[PDB]
Design a protein around this nucleic acid. Sequence first.
RNA 1: AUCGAGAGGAUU
Lengths: 559, 43, 263, 196, 159, 133, 65, 114, 141, 102, 84, 49
Amino acid sequence: RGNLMGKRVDFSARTVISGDPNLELDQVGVPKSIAKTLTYPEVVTPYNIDRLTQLVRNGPNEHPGAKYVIRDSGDRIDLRYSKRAGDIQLQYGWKVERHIMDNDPVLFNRQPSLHKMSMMAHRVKVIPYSTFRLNLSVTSPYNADFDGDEMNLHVPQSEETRAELSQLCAVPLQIVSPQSNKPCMGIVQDTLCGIRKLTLRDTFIELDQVLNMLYWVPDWDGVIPTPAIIKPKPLWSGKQILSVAIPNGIHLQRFDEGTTLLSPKDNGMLIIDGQIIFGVVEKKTVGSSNGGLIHVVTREKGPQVCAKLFGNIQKVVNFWLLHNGFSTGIGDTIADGPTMREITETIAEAKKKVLDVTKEAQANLLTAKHGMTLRESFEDNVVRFLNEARDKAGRLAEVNLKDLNNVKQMVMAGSKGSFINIAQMSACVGQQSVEGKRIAFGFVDRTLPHFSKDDYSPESKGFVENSYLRGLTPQEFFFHAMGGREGLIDTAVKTAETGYIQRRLVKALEDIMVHYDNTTRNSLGNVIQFIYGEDGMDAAHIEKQSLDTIGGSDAAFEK
Amino acid sequence: TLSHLRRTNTPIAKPRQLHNTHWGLVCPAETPEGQACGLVKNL
Amino acid sequence: EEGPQVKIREASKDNVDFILSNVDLAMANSLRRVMIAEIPTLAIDSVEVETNTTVLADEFIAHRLGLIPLQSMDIEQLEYSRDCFCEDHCDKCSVVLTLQAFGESESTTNVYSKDLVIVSNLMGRNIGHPIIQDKEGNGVLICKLRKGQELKLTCVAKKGIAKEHAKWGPAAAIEFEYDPWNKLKHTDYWYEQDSAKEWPQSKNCEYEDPPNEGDPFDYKAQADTFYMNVESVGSIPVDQVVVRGIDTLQKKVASILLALTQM
Amino acid sequence: ASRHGQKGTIGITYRREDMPFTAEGIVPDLIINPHAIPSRMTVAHLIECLLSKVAALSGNEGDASPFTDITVEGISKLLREHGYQSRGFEVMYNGHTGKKLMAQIFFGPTYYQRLRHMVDDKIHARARGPMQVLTRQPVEGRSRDGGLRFGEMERDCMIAHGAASFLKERLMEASDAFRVHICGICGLMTVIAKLN
Amino acid sequence: YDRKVPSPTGEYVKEPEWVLETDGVNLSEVMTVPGIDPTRIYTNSFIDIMEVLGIEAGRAALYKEVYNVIASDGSYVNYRHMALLVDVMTTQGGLTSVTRHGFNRSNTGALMRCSFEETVEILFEAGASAELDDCRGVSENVILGQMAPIGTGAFDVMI
Amino acid sequence: SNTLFDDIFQVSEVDPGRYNKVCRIEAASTTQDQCKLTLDINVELFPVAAQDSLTVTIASSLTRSWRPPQAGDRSLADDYDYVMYGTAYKFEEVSKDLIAVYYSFGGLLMRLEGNYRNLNNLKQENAYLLIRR
Amino acid sequence: MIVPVRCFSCGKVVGDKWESYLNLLQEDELDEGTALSRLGLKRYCCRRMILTHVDLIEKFLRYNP
Amino acid sequence: MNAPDRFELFLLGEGESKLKIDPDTKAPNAVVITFEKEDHTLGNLIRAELLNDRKVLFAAYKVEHPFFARFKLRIQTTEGYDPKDALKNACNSIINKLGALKTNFETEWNLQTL
Amino acid sequence: EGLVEYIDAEEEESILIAMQPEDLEPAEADVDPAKRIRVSHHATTFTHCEIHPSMILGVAASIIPFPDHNQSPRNTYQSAMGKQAMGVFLTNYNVRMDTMANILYYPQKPLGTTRAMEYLKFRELPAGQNAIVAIACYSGY
Amino acid sequence: QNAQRDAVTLFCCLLRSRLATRRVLQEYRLTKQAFDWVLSNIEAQFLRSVVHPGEMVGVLAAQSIGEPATQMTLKKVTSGVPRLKEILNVAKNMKTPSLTVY
Amino acid sequence: KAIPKDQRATTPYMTKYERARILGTRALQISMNAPVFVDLEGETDPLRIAMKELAEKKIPLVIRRYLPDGSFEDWSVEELIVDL
Amino acid sequence: FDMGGYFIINGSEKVLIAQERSAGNIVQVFKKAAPSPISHVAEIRSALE
RNA sequence: AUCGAGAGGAUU
Ligand SMILES: [Mg+2]
Ligand SMILES: [Zn+2]
Ligand SMILES: [Zn+2]
Ligand SMILES: [Zn+2]
């Protein structure tokens, strides 16, 4: 399991990785230094001698060049020494081991690999800086941001070993993944957090920008769209030109909450042909979602057309965004005084409400809910009463937050963060827990020795009454310290338990492979499924459709 | 340097937890994530 | 005169706070850029080391002298050593400098840039004097020394630009604001209560009019007037900065005109 | 990285010109992204920056020390008197163009550690170097012009793609390969290859 | 428990039902009970289900569970994959487990069962039971570095 | 090449719907009591208010990259103060003997409702919109 | 650690200003606030070049030869 | 160590022109000129001064990637008016603006005290 | 003189520590809305006070500016990386001859110290420049 | 051909409901050309959705259940990664057994 | 034994795995200067040459599809539909 | 500044790390599992200082 | 070279 199943291997490489907005999807930022070493064995052939011959002279040290030149005799010419190393007469049917150059098949993965899609083929762009640079978009499958993670390149040596990468492994053909019959790569960060911004009704773009933008997209036919506004000024809408990124025949329909063919929320989404008609563009649409655009443009137009679709939505979005801004001050996490009141006066009633249950349960009036301890139903009475204050309070500060609020705004796009992220930050942090129980008694019948014995109120038992903006108290701190300390425990071991699960799951399915009869079997030739997936269909090409024979009145059905 | 001189090992029911009684002796926070997390302690 | 209107209000030997009436935003900008970056200067760029017993290491010190500011007045009649036909440096392309200094006393011996020494023929052009603004009269502070510590250096100073390293920048900090009140609404203020009680009136709200609640949003209006101020390290004095900036921007605009003519 | 788990690597480097920049004339040392704020909830980060501004200004020391009666209110009324808007925002201008920023931006003096892990100390590639003695396979580390372990766990992602000829070559042409002689009768390597 | 179900008039409506939730199990004696539906009753042990309703329900149960692990998280895998897994465990008579006791002893060639767990005794008794190895299964042809009968290697090419 | 509709409307409601540079406007026709119009209007370029009245046209005329103005020296089908260009998506039955057209000027929307327009507001790519006074 | 020439942020040479900063504090008994402003340090980027500056050169010297 | 020396930002390497000029295929009468060892400091200015000329349909520049010191300008113009002229008569207009700037600044400079 | 007293965890069991030695035991005879919510005095038996709560931290955390406004994890994460930071690691680095060593050209005290940086001698051997940072969406990186 | 008939059963209930006589004509007024295409299209676009002989759908289905398990970290029941482990060992000694009576 | 010219079920289409390999297999042959069977209208990449040789049904190979029992079918790279 | 605490063993500093061990010589009551016969145990690690 | 341990990175 160490030298056969998994060998250490040649022609490979790895660096730190970094995300290059101005790179296309299927691409791979490969530092000169690296591409200066790896080497594909190519044959002397009438079609290439003019390139190749120049490459051998171009020498093992400047870029597009080569070490080792192989002969009839199958001996080795070592270009970096050798007396005839600025000579050599490539004599047909010889190999020249060149540098790796632009537009090549490279198999780019990551540990820990858990998909077909952890690994895939990219096209090589040789670059400055010792790092591997890839398209943010391609930051999903691989899984890993730009906080320090390395990645691995494997340069194939057979012409098929090529093909088999570019035809089967190549990146865009991974876009919509079998795993879950939806795409797996979808715009993110800025891009999304601004593609929302760009698309607001209130976002109008005057001429000077509109031309760079237009020009920015590399497939633009040269035909400036007529501006939505032609009046006292000539402006377009943000939507207007984003719509230049979206191809033709693409139709997309949504409906959300208040979506009424006029959306007085700009809620929902409607995309008729290359043009967006109404709606505000964000996650649901452009995220690697099911009912969204990427899914659609792939199945519709091509993986290719869909791959090039990414970097267009990008090239514009990032640009618009550049000359707009966006951020987050701590002002993004203040809250109105008269709410800061209402939240504390929401917390007090809920602390002073646990005080009364506790009061009651101590005079033996608390009734035993069928099938649990008298105590147990009191823990349950409490947790629920404080988990509820925090939510009421958090949502009380979700209401308070204005529209310009960068946080409320990323969450509005769905770029980073949810609700809770706010609720805590600005209003209250809630109850802490270990082994699904509120804060334990280490010190006999108390939590910390800054406390009486037998105190069952929330402050005593782990209820961080303050927001993060306000600051936690010494006790609060330590309690929450006891919390998080649990999260860190799992991700240390709950990952090896997973790591083994998979090893077995993998070693147990393995050779199950749809045969030519479409019957699914194994090495013995024993049937498991007489038709894959009970319908002999690939997980990729499918999508959730409504069978509206099923719903509706017997009445409305006849109609 | 200062951090390493003040270090605690613990060979091998709920050891890894940051337990009530730790307040004042072990740092609530300083501890090496992952590998042998929460077993090792800084005073 | 005709157009692009400058007017000073306060200008020292290092500041030139001016308005700039009647200009395309583009240029008003592409001037600063070409300034910050593109206006050549001489600074130390090669330190031959003989003996050094300081508590800072070789390739530090050298990096120090890098920044140390050198008189770049007559500089535009000094050659680029990448051009000049001589091998390595010549007093046609460079100003060779020396620094010795030795730990003499019990009290810590300093090394100022005032302790720098020209050595090549200047041919009487004004170049490579390590600038002082220091009231005491001691340029920068290179290094420090205790009783027995030499230091034997030979700094060639070559012509370069901030685009090759911020040592050859001769500019530093350039204030630059347009339209104080958001008459243009190129911004959208962040706030909690009054957007007016919560952001500060900029010094430059006396030189424009307030908008008056009633008037509707002036649309087809564009960006005049640009409240600048240029500070100067001082290798070139203030006036010259702005001047050589206006100059270079224009030169590298012309090298285009010239390039079209050759095709 | 900063001081709050907010670890990160450089990504690009923009010379003082095309960088954004404020009306005072500033030129940030580095830019990060608001993204790093809400999902990790480290609020001390922006706080230290807001509080630090005030340090840089009044010229005093930042009393960041934990359980204390310091607040964002209290800092903010100090930045108020001190020239700026109480919450750390400054009207910045784009670099390329010089067009005013539609937005404002948080921007402050904020301590930041330069960490170990160096880029130019990983960048390893291999093209066939030395081999182990036992296996005739490649050699671990980077330090020996190593190899990269084709994961057994990564072989499974090859299988997955259906790419097979790539998987023979990764495992053979390089890693190993070797030409043995087998007897048609006794199915072993008893064969003495008195070749030539 | 909430329950969508047809009105005569046609539509699906909200008929909310009382459902009873348990701690512990003996299906062999609970479904036999008066007044409860013994076509619908559900216990989350898929091993008791297997004993009572017999293998083919067993499958459906085990699946429901496996799924309900995934979806509880808000995740979603396409039926086919889980189905498969489930179906795999299900085929060889009973409930073939995902550990050496289960799947990895089942009549496969030796070189394969080599790559999993008990690497030596597999090879031992496989040299004494004089097993003949098939060489049709990934692991076998990795171990001798051949193009394993896989996608690109499923068929042979001829001229 | 010619007009497709024209009417004088009474502005009955203004709606700053969490916005600064856009409004949704509620206005109804004078004379014909079988008509209302809801429309999105850049209230920075042309402020409207409650109990105003505005003339409203359509056209489809006065398809190759939109040439920048230069049109102090060209025809401009506008004595009009404020003019937008858009596309129509669906056309709506309000049962009857009634109709409604749905318009989208890159994001800004327009709902118009009546009857006689049957043989005017086409299913078309074209459609400008002209407000004035 | 010998006080920088020029700020990393602004560019204003900060070389000369170190000695001057010392005296301003302990000679005429000023406060770091106002004694930073006496030397033309408005731009807080350049202002915190001098304030945070930690001068260990003094110690390095203590070691003998 | 992979790092490309700064000077590669203002000096021209080999076989490299300052300007390469190319016809657009998408539009009629349109042109895309490349500018080596340039950027925004220059581009942005040419483009915005080229939007002043009334006889100019389209004008745009892009820095395709921060690592390189290029940038492309694409200009579309009226029937008959060659794009190059539009650049020429645009370039000059700049110089002439800058030329009187220089002088106007002078006249002011000299009048002050300090 | 008996003004302090060593107390171990075992012993700890039988005591009643107060947190603030001020606010937490004068009389109980108007309330700035920004100041966090501090519980109360609800105890009359105090034997011991705590010195300063800030002390439940050990070395690494005691470098963090307001850990108390942050969440567990991170605080922990920083502790792991404060160890990996870089600069003035000793003064005699010139005279030592150890494998590896990394020293910061221009290390600074931070602009925002802890009350422990004091005795951790951080101010004097720091690791980190006090860099100007922008946290807004730019360029595309 | 009696599996083939079943192996399409579901897909059809749709197909038949979406290409219904009153629907085609009333709801989305198709023509004859269009229709013949709508068919011509489906038939092919369907045919492209069949699994490929080759496809190593073991490994596939393992990973496909593996990954999202790796996305599990933390009203009483053995759920999350601990339950998955239980299920896969065919655990006889389960922590939370339960009937659910109807 | 074998399998007849008729009585063939096996997806008459081309499976990626087939096609990917077909290309590859000829894309070897090509890059070793064997004969070309099309007019190379502008390209010189040997796999881009095999994509065109395919586009015009002129690759003289015959997929040999193995069914589990051991029996097997044949398809010239002319008989096979190439949709995808 | 160097605070000591270490040793020096072949020109390389070495720290001894504080080991943790369950205390000796104290009484502990330990409720045992379901399938085990013993229900409670009282333990004492006994050692001489 | 080989075997042996410990420190750290990446999954937030
Ligand atoms: Mg990472
Ligand atoms: Zn010379
Ligand atoms: Zn034999
Ligand atoms: Zn500064």
